[PDB]
């Protein structure tokens, strides 16, 4: 026994769950059964003949990387079914050998050094297949002759001998080289795998391009917000590799590894809601049926549980508290239902320990300046905002995936409440892709995948408790510009639109909301105190609307109210929509099964070729019909301004004033005066203090932002970057935003 053997065994346990994997545990046993059932299904459908042209008819074609990668995944499942203590296939000789025969046959007829390393899809050949093959080699190590292992490992070395890529691709490379290095016992290669994590897109914070940013954002493919997609993969791989090497001669020593803890607290936590990983950060992966928000969120908690196994104090303890909470929070899909059996074992250990208390739910407003995203987390709900600009692309669509992701990041609002299933349960293949909530578009018209020509995208954060965002809109596919803002307060999100103009000759509309209803599609809903019909297939216009109320899919915690300052005319419809995942993910493996979901869609028609059009609505989560009407009788927010120059909203109760200035000219909105493009929010406590935060959303002002507040102060404290020049009779200061990268600067003034 050497250290390599020790490592190999440690990885085996990570795959199998270990020798102490208790079969009495309801969930552990529930998993060790589906594993065999799936293996027997594959083992039964195999072609065990010696003249076979394929292992599985369903996956024939030794050239289509897609099918071959799937073949190796199946053989991986089978290997697991044969090595997981508790499987009704544990230690089966015929199964082990039938697997090794398949591998040899694949070596000679498909996966070998005679093929191009860069053939479509390079990912399968260099990362996908090797990751499965390495796992099979570890699991069936003892039943693998030297002759066989050579063909397996030599081939993997040919495809991925080194680590030289970035982000996920880089981390994936590390785990390929590392596990193999363990199997063949190459301390040099294992040292290189360890060192790979210090590379671009992983441990070190990115300031541009792919990687994790200091502000919490994550980007991949240069211009896409990807915390929930490639980010998840980077996390999982980095967590698995680090855990593997922890304590060994190759244990990660890079001090930047501590950044990983921050990824959890800053990059992932604010974007999780009762087990769901917000879709706005999952790129093209929203089009994958096997990766809807909760399934993905489960994988993220699985990594947290993994880190909790070796992370230093007090992170391990905190990770455990985080996982425990998410597991209890998610009553939609059992967490133990789709994570590794080893994750179940470790998870249960945390959940059953009384000394471990569930972490508190996040409560904040966060601006992810680096990826044009923003989130509001509160008790009972969460709002995610997806924007795009000259820096972040509208959406990503490659390899025939996410072809209808058009407006998923164009001022799109995502509301999370007690209806944990809203965005799962086949939402993406059935929702109207042209009517993503919160967006302003040319009816039934798409836009291109790419960055915009506007730099003004982002917002300001007030001490991480309240905030405001904005997106200067100007699509390239057709003519349509507008100023769009969102103001996040306690339990109200005010949305404002102005300068809505177009010469496209296409009806222009703004989507107030588009929600998936219950199976019957009969969610009650009301307008101005009057109930509206609940039937499906009914379109109807609501004119002179002050407020609307929609009942959620759950008795409590999922109602949504909508208040319209000044009243509005609403175009709506309630319909059953059918579609297939194949329609948004055109890959042979994608199920073509038809699914039907019900929706209540509401939008404002601005007509064709509007000029200076505008809208203003307030989202009121978790309020009953009675409460929405109560609000309407004395709304807490007050629109200060909604012109193409400035959009401002005031929240009477909290003393909050938010203002988005869109031009480089001196302008005023209530107490706030600005001389440049800026996102500003102030909070006033009568005769106590005046708080203020300011950002340069354009991330391009190389000078300052001159602000003036119509109040007289007695003193102040401020972030460096802010220089105060006057406190009386009015407040005056400048914010040095050169290279601020969209961050907010905070000042606090003492009032007499």
3-state secondary structure 76-107: HHHHHHCCCCCCCCCCCHHHHHHHHHHHHHHH
| Residue 618 and residue 652 in one domain | no
Rounded to whole angstroms, the Cα distance separating 178 from 189 reads 7
The neighbour count for residue 347, using CB atoms within 10 Å, is 24
Rounded to whole angstroms, the Cα distance separating 373 from 389 reads 11
* DSSP codes of every residue in 423-483: TSSS-TTTS-TT--TT-EEETT----SS--S---EEEEEETTTEEEEEEEEE-SSS--EEE
* CA nearest neighbour of 631 among 546, 551, 748: 546
Beta carbons of 566 and 534 less than 8 angstroms apart:
no
Beta carbons of 16 and 23 less than 8 angstroms apart:
no
* CA nearest neighbour of 647 among 636, 659, 664: 659
Which pair of structure tokens corresponds to residue 363?
A: 């409560």
Beta carbons of 653 and 433 less than 8 angstroms apart:
no
* CA nearest neighbour of 318 among 264, 365, 366: 264
* CA nearest neighbour of 388 among 456, 480, 440, 437: 456
Rounded to whole angstroms, the Cα distance separating 90 from 411 reads 52
| Residue 59 and residue 77 in one domain | yes
Beta carbons of 414 and 356 less than 8 angstroms apart:
no
Q: What dihedral do alpha carbons 598, 603, 605, 611 form, nearest 10°?
A: -140
Cis, bond preceding 314 (omega within 30 deg of 0): yes
54 included as an active-site residue = no
Rounded to whole angstroms, the Cα distance separating 447 from 354 reads 52
* CA nearest neighbour of 681 among 711, 663, 661: 661
Rounded to whole angstroms, the Cα distance separating 284 from 57 reads 29
| Residue 428 and residue 458 in one domain | yes
**Containing structural domain, residue 628:** 362-634
Rounded to whole angstroms, the Cα distance separating 627 from 329 reads 26
Cα atoms in the 13 Å half-sphere on the side-chain side of 165: 21
The residues, any chain, with a CB within 8 Å of residue 227's CB and separated by 6 or more, are: 217, 218, 267, 268, 271, 277, 281, 282, 371
Which pair of structure tokens corresponds to residue 598?
A: 């019900």
Residue 538 CA, distance from chain mean position: 33
Rounded to whole angstroms, the Cα distance separating 221 from 210 reads 6
The residues, any chain, with a CB within 8 Å of residue 102's CB and separated by 6 or more, are: 46, 55, 71, 75
Beta carbons of 604 and 571 less than 8 angstroms apart:
yes
Which pair of structure tokens corresponds to residue 201?
A: 């897109």
Assign residue 354 a region: left if phi > 0, alpha if psi is -120 to 50, beta otherwise?
A: alpha
Q: How many residues does the chain have?
A: 752
Which pair of structure tokens corresponds to residue 722?
A: 């802010």
* HEC letters along 618-650: EEEECCCHHHHHHHHHCCCEEEEEECCCEEEEE
Beta carbons of 720 and 745 less than 8 angstroms apart:
no
* CA nearest neighbour of 714 among 728, 732, 725: 728
Rounded to whole angstroms, the Cα distance separating 204 from 166 reads 11
Strands of the sheet containing 364-368, edge to edge, are 364-368, 373-378, 381-386, 412-416
Distances (CA, A) of 252 to 304, 575, 577: 17, 54, 51
Which pair of structure tokens corresponds to residue 557?
A: 């915690």
Rounded to whole angstroms, the Cα distance separating 269 from 662 reads 31
Number of domains in the chain: 3
Cis, bond preceding 111 (omega within 30 deg of 0): no
Beta carbons of 315 and 261 less than 8 angstroms apart:
yes
Assign residue 564 a region: left if phi > 0, alpha if psi is -120 to 50, beta otherwise?
A: beta
Q: Which residues partner with 563 through β-bridges?
A: 547, 618
Rounded to whole angstroms, the Cα distance separating 459 from 372 reads 9
| Residue 691 and residue 639 in one domain | yes
Rounded to whole angstroms, the Cα distance separating 422 from 425 reads 7
The residues, any chain, with a CB within 8 Å of residue 426's CB and separated by 6 or more, are: 289, 579, 581, 595, 597
Residue 206 CA, distance from chain mean position: 18
Rounded to whole angstroms, the Cα distance separating 467 from 465 reads 7
The neighbour count for residue 520, using CB atoms within 10 Å, is 9
| Residue 244 and residue 305 in one domain | yes
Strands of the sheet containing 689-695, edge to edge, are 637-642, 646-651, 656-661, 678-685, 689-695, 744-751, 713-718
* DSSP codes of every residue in 271-315: GEETTEE-GGGSGGGGG-GGG-HHHHHHHHHHHHHHHTTTPPTTH
The residues, any chain, with a CB within 8 Å of residue 555's CB and separated by 6 or more, are: none
Domain-terminating residue out of 361, 386, 416:
361
Which pair of structure tokens corresponds to residue 664?
A: 């480089």
Beta carbons of 356 and 319 less than 8 angstroms apart:
no
- The DSSP symbol for 609 reads S
Rounded to whole angstroms, the Cα distance separating 634 from 637 reads 9
Distances (CA, A) of 623 to 230, 544, 548, 628, 629: 36, 21, 11, 6, 9
Cα atoms in the 13 Å half-sphere on the side-chain side of 512: 31
- The DSSP symbol for 585 reads B
Beta carbons of 432 and 645 less than 8 angstroms apart:
no
* DSSP codes of every residue in 100-163: HHHHHHHHHHTSSTTS-TTSS-HHIIIIIHHHHHHHHHHHTGGG--HHHHHHHHHHHHHH-SS-
CATH number assigned to the domain comprising residue 561 = 2.70.98.10
Domain-terminating residue out of 634, 658, 684:
634
Cis, bond preceding 9 (omega within 30 deg of 0): no
Q: Which residues partner with 542 through β-bridges?
A: 570
* CA nearest neighbour of 438 among 600, 603, 608, 597: 603
Domain-terminating residue out of 584, 619, 634:
634
| Residue 261 and residue 330 in one domain | yes
| Residue 593 and residue 674 in one domain | no
The residues, any chain, with a CB within 8 Å of residue 704's CB and separated by 6 or more, are: 676, 734, 735, 736, 737, 738
Rounded to whole angstroms, the Cα distance separating 150 from 156 reads 10
Which is catalytic among the residues 54, 152, 230, 615?
230
Residue whose entry in the numeric block shows the structure tokens 């085996």: 12
Q: What dihedral do alpha carbons 414, 627, 538, 513 form, nearest 10°?
A: -20
Which pair of structure tokens corresponds to residue 613?
A: 């059009």
Beta carbons of 703 and 682 less than 8 angstroms apart:
no
Which pair of structure tokens corresponds to residue 577?
A: 């929509």
Rounded to whole angstroms, the Cα distance separating 473 from 411 reads 9
Rounded to whole angstroms, the Cα distance separating 174 from 165 reads 10
Beta carbons of 197 and 164 less than 8 angstroms apart:
no
Rounded to whole angstroms, the Cα distance separating 106 from 100 reads 10
Distances (CA, A) of 279 to 15, 193, 213: 28, 31, 19
Beta carbons of 431 and 502 less than 8 angstroms apart:
no
Beta carbons of 176 and 126 less than 8 angstroms apart:
yes
Rounded to whole angstroms, the Cα distance separating 208 from 222 reads 8
Q: Which residues partner with 568 through β-bridges?
A: 545
Distances (CA, A) of 716 to 238, 305, 652, 696: 44, 44, 24, 22
CATH number assigned to the domain comprising residue 116 = 1.50.10.100
| Residue 585 and residue 652 in one domain | no
Rounded to whole angstroms, the Cα distance separating 600 from 575 reads 7
Beta carbons of 263 and 235 less than 8 angstroms apart:
yes
Rounded to whole angstroms, the Cα distance separating 179 from 328 reads 33
Which pair of structure tokens corresponds to residue 507?
A: 């009806």
Map residue 663 onto helix, strand or coil. coil
Rounded to whole angstroms, the Cα distance separating 573 from 512 reads 12
519 burial (CB, 10 Å; 0-12 / 13-18 / 19+) is: exposed
| Residue 346 and residue 453 in one domain | no
Radius of gyration, CA atoms only, the chain: 27
Which pair of structure tokens corresponds to residue 39?
A: 């293996």
Which pair of structure tokens corresponds to residue 518?
A: 């219950």
Which pair of structure tokens corresponds to residue 683?
A: 């909070």
Q: Which residues partner with 680 through β-bridges?
A: 659, 694
Residue 138 CA, distance from chain mean position: 32
| Residue 451 and residue 489 in one domain | yes
Beta carbons of 436 and 511 less than 8 angstroms apart:
yes
Element (H, E) at 207: none
Q: Which residues partner with 547 through β-bridges?
A: 563
229 burial (CB, 10 Å; 0-12 / 13-18 / 19+) is: buried
| Residue 353 and residue 450 in one domain | no
Rounded to whole angstroms, the Cα distance separating 558 from 622 reads 6
The neighbour count for residue 353, using CB atoms within 10 Å, is 11
| Residue 584 and residue 656 in one domain | no
Rounded to whole angstroms, the Cα distance separating 618 from 642 reads 14
CATH number assigned to the domain comprising residue 644 = 2.60.220.10
The residues, any chain, with a CB within 8 Å of residue 687's CB and separated by 6 or more, are: 751, 752
* CA nearest neighbour of 452 among 420, 435, 475, 421: 475
């Amino acid at each position: 026994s050497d250290e390599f053997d020790a490592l190999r065994i440690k990885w085996a346990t990570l795959l199998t769950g270990g020798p102490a994997l208790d079969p009495a545990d309801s969930d552990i046993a529930a998993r060790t059964d589906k594993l065999a059932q799936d293996a027997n299904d594959y083992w039964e459908d195999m072609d065990l003949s010696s003249s076979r042209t394929y292992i599985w008819y369903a996956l024939r074609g030794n050239g289509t990387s897609d099918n071959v990668n799937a073949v190796y995944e199946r053989l991986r499942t089978m290997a697991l079914a044969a090595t997981t203590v508790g499987s009704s296939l544990y230690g089966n000789a015929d199964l082990k050998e039938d697997i090794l025969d398949a591998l040899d046959w694949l070596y000679v007829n498909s996966y070998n050094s005679t093929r191009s390393r860069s053939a479509y899809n390079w990912w399968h050949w260099q990362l996908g297949i090797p990751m499965s093959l390495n796992d099979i080699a570890v699991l069936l190590y003892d039943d693998i002759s030297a002759a066989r292992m050579a063909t397996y490992m030599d081939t993997i070395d040919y495809f991925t001998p080194s680590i030289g890529l970035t982000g996920a691709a880089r981390a994936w490379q590390a785990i390929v080289v590392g596990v193999r290095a363990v199997i063949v016992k190459d301390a040099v290669k294992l040292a290189a795998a360890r060192n790979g994590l210090s590379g671009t897109g992983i441990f070190p914070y990115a300031t541009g391009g792919d990687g994790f940013y200091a502000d919490g954002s994550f980007v991949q493919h240069t211009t896409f917000a990807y915390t929930g997609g490639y980010g998840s993969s980077v996390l999982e791989t980095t967590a698995n590799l680090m855990y593997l090497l922890s304590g060994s001669t190759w244990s990660v020593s890079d001090p930047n590894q501590s950044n990983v803890w921050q990824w959890i607290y800053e990059a992932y936590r604010p974007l999780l809601y009762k087990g769901a990983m917000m879709d706005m950060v999952r790129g093209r992966e929203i089009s994958r049926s096997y990766a809807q928000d909760h399934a993905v969120g489960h994988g993220i908690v699985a990594s947290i549980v993994r880190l909790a196994q070796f992370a230093p104090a007090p992170h391990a303890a905190a990770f455990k508290q985080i996982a425990k909470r998410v597991i209890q929070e998610d009553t939609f899909s059992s967490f133990y239902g789709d994570v590794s059996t080893d994750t179940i074992r470790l998870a249960k250990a945390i959940v059953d320990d009384p000394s471990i208390a569930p972490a508190a739910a996040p409560n904040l407003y966060k601006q992810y300046a680096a990826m044009d995203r923003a989130v509001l987390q509160r008790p009972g709900f969460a709002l995610g905002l997806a924007l795009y600009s000259t820096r972040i692309s509208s959406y990503e669509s490659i390899n025939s995936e996410n072809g209808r992701g058009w407006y998923t990041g164009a001022g799109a609002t995502y509301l999370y409440n007690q209806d944990l299933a809203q965005y799962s349960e086949d939402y993406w293949p059935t929702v109207d892709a042209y009517r993503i909530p919160g967006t302003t578009v040319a009816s039934g018209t798409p836009i291109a995948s790419g960055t915009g020509t506007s730099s003004w995208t982002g917002g300001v954060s007030l001490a991480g408790q309240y905030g405001a965002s904005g997106m200067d809109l100007s699509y390239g596919a057709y003519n349509l510009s507008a100023r769009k803002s969102w103001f996040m307060f306690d339990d109200e999100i005010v949305a404002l639109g102005s300068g809505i103009s177009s010469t496209a000759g296409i009806p222009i509309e703004t989507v107030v909301d588009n929600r998936k209803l219950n199976g019957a599609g009969d969610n009650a809903w009301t307008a101005n105190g009057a109930a509206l019909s609940t039937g499906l297939g009914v379109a109807q216009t609501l004119t002179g609307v002050n407020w609307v109320h929609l009942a959620g899919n759950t008795a409590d915690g999922s109602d949504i109210g909508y208040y319209f300052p000044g009243g509005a005319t609403l175009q709506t419809k309630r319909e059953a929509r059918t579609g297939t995942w194949k329609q948004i993910n055109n890959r042979p493996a994608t199920p073509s099964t038809a699914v039907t979901r019900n929706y209540e869609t509401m939008w404002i028609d601005h007509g064709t070729n509007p000029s200076g059009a505008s809208y203003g609505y307030v989202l009121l989560p978790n309020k009953t019909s009675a409460q929405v009407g109560a609000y309407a009788a004395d709304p807490a927010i007050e629109i200060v301004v909604n012109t193409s120059g400035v959009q401002s909203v005031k929240e009477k109760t909290l003393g909050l004033v938010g203002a988005n200035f869109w031009t480089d000219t001196t302008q005023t909105a209530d107490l706030i005066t600005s001389n440049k493009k800026a996102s500003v929010m102030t909070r006033e406590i009568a005769d106590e203090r005046l708080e203020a935060s300011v950002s340069d959303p354009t991330q391009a002002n190389n000078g300052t932002i001159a602000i003036e507040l119509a109040r007289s102060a007695e003193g102040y404290s401020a972030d460096p970057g802010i220089t105060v020049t006057q406190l009386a009779p009015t407040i005056k200061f400048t914010v040095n935003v050169n290279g601020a990268k969209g961050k907010s600067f905070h000042a606090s003034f003492q009032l007499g």
